[PDB]
Amino acid sequence: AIPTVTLNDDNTLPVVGIGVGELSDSEAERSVSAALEAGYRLIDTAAAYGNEAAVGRAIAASGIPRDEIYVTTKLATPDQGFTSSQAAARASLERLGLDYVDLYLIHWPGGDTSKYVDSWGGLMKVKEDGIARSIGVCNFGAEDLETIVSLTYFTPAVNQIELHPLLNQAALREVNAGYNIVTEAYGPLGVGRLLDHPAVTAIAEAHGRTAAQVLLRWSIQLGNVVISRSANPERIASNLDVFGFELTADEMETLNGLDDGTRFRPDPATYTGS
């Protein structure tokens, strides 16, 4: 019953998915299996997390037709390059045990414009070859976006960015929308630190819902595709259950008022890792 968004290349994605981040092989397989059983279809991993094969095993064992599942993975920063990115996409497929992925992203700008531009050209070939249905970016700022769009005339389908009430990304969301790029929010609970924020708990108590439900619903109402995570099968199911209520404009405004620039994940302006 999950709503979808339509991308600029005519493909569609669910508005909520599960990301595994740096979970160990065993934990990654466990959470993806639980998510699929609960009804998640958008699954997000990365080569840099080292757990692609584990995710692939959860998918293989699920008994769900491949066509119904939306798999995202990412180009690790050390693998950037025109030729190297095409090889890295194919290596990711081998690890995942898949013939294609649905979304393939540059993981970080990585602090070298030549290299991320070349990586983008590589990704365009990856898409042309049918290796990835859609291509996009993660943690790109407005200047990085202008650079790839200016030089290649090919616009990312998605820009996956850290986003939560302490870092609401209003400015970058507006840039994304102007280019017809979908915003994918990650880290929506702020490593769980936001679950006890008093503004969040007041709104949860007002609705008879949980803090986590409030944080995820707020992000959905901004128009984002929302990537969440839990290692617990019941909480995973609870994180999908965010279509039974709506936050009011007053409550949206309160949560929109909390931005203070807090990043729990690295800053892409500086970060040169993956």
Ligand SMILES: Nc1ncnc2c1ncn2[C@@H]1O[C@H](COP(=O)(O)OP(=O)(O)OC[C@H]2OC[C@H](O)[C@@H]2O)[C@@H](O)[C@H]1OP(=O)(O)O
């Ligand atoms: N429903 C619910 N209720 C109570 N506690 C919960 C719930 N869901 C998750 N959690 C907990 O919140 C904490 C934050 O987890 P995290 O995966 O970093 O979450 P983020 O949102 O910061 O980032 C997720 C990102 O990791 C990678 C990917 O990019 C994701 O966007 C963690 O201790 C979880 O414990 P638990 O025991 O696992 O449930």
